[PDB]
Design a protein around this ligand. Structure first.
Ligand SMILES: [Mg+2]
Ligand SMILES: [Mg+2]
Length: 211
């Protein structure tokens, strides 16, 4: 069911059970929330999903304890991809009404799962991706990508690359979810927003690729 946005518990970050899961923990990014909502949990292990918040101001989505990040891992064009994604209860822009729900994502591109060298970064912005190829070292704290979440007049929120330090969140990976949670993430209508790591995952990787 769709439940109150504050009734979806944070999904604790489990230990990584295989090499895929360990890689996604290793490359977990930092996020600098410049304005708007903090990230919240979108789904619980029973498959209930967040109702978000009505766009009618971000005081209602500032709870630091609700932090969560998602990932899903795959491959495209012989490259290894880890998509990290954040859900916010609303897009609360600097100007304008905004929307209930927000989903954004970055992709960390590696040469392969063993060498695990970062070759590029992609960050979702409106209907496309910003791309840093080769990955600009100023956007990396070691192997930790530094991402911003910000709205600039007259636009809604977008991700971007930043030199600024950010914060990290407990990571739950698609591969570690219950089936009920995967099913709910596939089927649920998030209105203006769309889960970017459901059955559209490969299509998103194609769009994020650094051609
Ligand atoms: Mg609250
Ligand atoms: Mg948005």
């Amino acid at each position: 069911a769709v439940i109150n946005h504050d009734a979806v518990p944070v999904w604790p970050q489990p230990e990584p059970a295989d090499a895929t899961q360990a890689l996604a923990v290793r490359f977990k990014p930092q996020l600098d929330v410049v304005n708007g909502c903090q990230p919240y949990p979108a789904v619980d292990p029973q498959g209930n999903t967040s109702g978000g918040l009505k766009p009618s101001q971000a005081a209602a989505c500032r709870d630091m304890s609700k932090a969560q990040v998602y990932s899903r891992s795959g491959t495209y064009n012989g490259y290894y991809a880890i998509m990290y994604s954040w859900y916010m209860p609303k897009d609360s822009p600097s100007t304008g009404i905004g929307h209930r729900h927000d989903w954004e994502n970055v992709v960390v591109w590696l040469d392969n799962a063993a060498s695990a060298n970062i070759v590029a970064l992609s960050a979702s912005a409106h209907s496309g991706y910003k791309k840093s190829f080769p990955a600009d070292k100023s956007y990396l704290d070691g192997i930790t990508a530094k991402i911003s979440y910000k709205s600039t007049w007259p636009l809604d929120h977008e991700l971007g690359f930043t030199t600024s330090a950010g914060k990290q969140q407990p990571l739950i990976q698609w591969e570690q979810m219950t089936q009920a949670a995967r099913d709910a993430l596939e089927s649920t209508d998030f209105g203006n927003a769309n889960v970017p790591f459901k059955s559209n995952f490969q299509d998103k990787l194609v769009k994020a690729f650094f051609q």
